[PDB]
Structure 1
């Protein structure tokens, strides 16, 4: 993979002399990352439905939570590893497979903080001849042939750091504001501000614009890095971009503002 990005784009038209507020806020921009609530992951196993019908959720488990089975008959029957989010082993164990367990299973990982979705499909087939039990690749997914009544383990492993409870060093979060003046292509944007979570601001370029640009650094703690431009001039027109790279999530966040300054009649 090269990059994963969350991008939002907006058109802003404001009268000259008024104030511009370019809102840039995200839970990723909250520096003190709660290892509990900012690390909520969920795994759930789904089973294919009937012809053209809806899938059925069998069991799910949130990180730092206990597994939940949705059919009371399947309690103590479908098992996840309680250490799944520590080692990255999200495999599903069926204690005794019957015909009602045949179908295509999906193992689904969701990172609610990092906006990451992962899915793996496994087809389970029940045989009444134990000699025919086997596992093979069908061209797109693993196929597991299991003797009726036997336990079956469908393997789902993802050991990437974002799914496990392994944490690298929490480095400094920096938020960048860029600007493209009218008629300047992308990749040639000029930096406007570097905004550090600890409160430091590094200004760039024009001293005739810096005096009207401001941020509220007391709102950095809640992930708000919005840009404020006072006394809007025609020269303020352009494409403003707020962007951040989140190391743990492996995620680029980008908010783009096409700002137009009008003049009253």
Structure 2
């Protein structure tokens, strides 16, 4: 709803004059050719509330590779997920026949290991012996499912966002001179995944700054300053926005030249 997701890494760097500075900026999000299989690993798992005060229990999970997995041998074919869950975004859990051992607070949990996104939804399941009392209600914090004993139950969990169901990237380097605030940061470089570099600085610094473009393929956009003068003191920032993930990734370096 705003600058929605950021991964910020801040560091302090103090190096001697004349030494070479290496500001590491590497991320799986910075690998341009994104593997539709391994750079898109999602997982959904349904957990059941534990005992009085500890240790929730995992019931079933499934990765975007497929083939859902049940942990208890009693629930091997009575707890079912949609095999197409990651195609249409329907992560609902189906119980063939609920018993009183299924009562409790369920959570439907989503994890995007590549985008670092977590989602969780709570549904409480109540077992009644009078089938006329079956109902669902209240969403004041969560919805409650009153299910007749022995009957099948479908606990709904939907998320049709594109990140869960299935583009040139640019990495920017900024610098803040001592005394300058954050919003007055001057651009230093634009690094394109295909190798292009756009220089902004004054040639008094531009001579000693360099990057290794051959390492862009593995998502490495690190900065290198060779002959460290005191004029290099400042706050260096490496920022990237990943459109598919909706994610800002930012690395901050407080550089100091002794």
Q: TM-score, normalised by structure 2?
A: 0.99
Distance in 2 of aligned mates of 1:206 and 1:255? 22
Give secondary structure in 1 for the equivalent of 2:164: coil
Distance in 2 of aligned mates of 1:3 and 1:151? 38
Distance in 2 of aligned mates of 1:137 and 1:32? 46
Larger mean CA deviation between 210-219 and 2-11 belongs to 2-11
For 1:86-140, what per-residue CA distance to the aligned partner results, in whole angstroms no more than 9, with x for missing partners? 0000000000000000000000000000000000000000000000000001510
Shift of 1:53: 1.7
Distance in 2 of aligned mates of 1:118 and 1:90? 12
For 1:213-258, what per-residue CA distance to the aligned partner results, in whole angstroms no more than 9, with x for missing partners? 0000000000000000001000000000000000000000000000
For 1:145-191, what per-residue CA distance to the aligned partner results, in whole angstroms no more than 9, with x for missing partners? 000000000000000000002xxxxx101000000000000111000
Give secondary structure in 2 for the equivalent of 1:28: helix
Match of 1:57 in 2: 58
Distance in 2 of aligned mates of 1:114 and 1:148? 40
Shift of 1:205: 2.5
Shift of 1:3: 1.9
**Number of residue pairs aligned between Structure 1 and Structure 2:** 257
Give secondary structure in 1 for the equivalent of 2:36: coil
Aligned counterparts, 1:39-188, within 5 A: 39-165=40-166, 171-188=167-184
Listed as ranges, the gaps of 5+ residues in structure 2 are none
For 1:41-93, what per-residue CA distance to the aligned partner results, in whole angstroms no more than 9, with x for missing partners? 00000000010021000000000221000001100110000000000000000
Shift of 1:2: 3.6
Give secondary structure in 2 for the equivalent of 1:182: coil
Give secondary structure in 2 for the equivalent of 1:39: coil
Match of 1:231 in 2: 227
Distance in 2 of aligned mates of 1:82 and 1:138? 28
Give secondary structure in 1 for the equivalent of 2:144: strand
Give secondary structure in 1 for the equivalent of 2:251: strand
Distance in 1 of aligned mates of 2:115 and 2:162? 12
Give secondary structure in 1 for the equivalent of 2:245: coil
For 1:195-214, what per-residue CA distance to the aligned partner results, in whole angstroms no more than 9, with x for missing partners? 00000000002110000000
For 1:15-58, what per-residue CA distance to the aligned partner results, in whole angstroms no more than 9, with x for missing partners? 00000000000000000000000000000000000100210000
Give secondary structure in 2 for the equivalent of 1:163: helix
Shift of 1:14: 0.1
Give secondary structure in 1 for the equivalent of 2:137: strand
Aligned-residue CA RMSD in angstroms? 0.6
Task: Give structure 1 regions of 4+ aligned residues with deviation exceeding 4 angstroms.
Answer: none
Give secondary structure in 1 for the equivalent of 2:87: helix
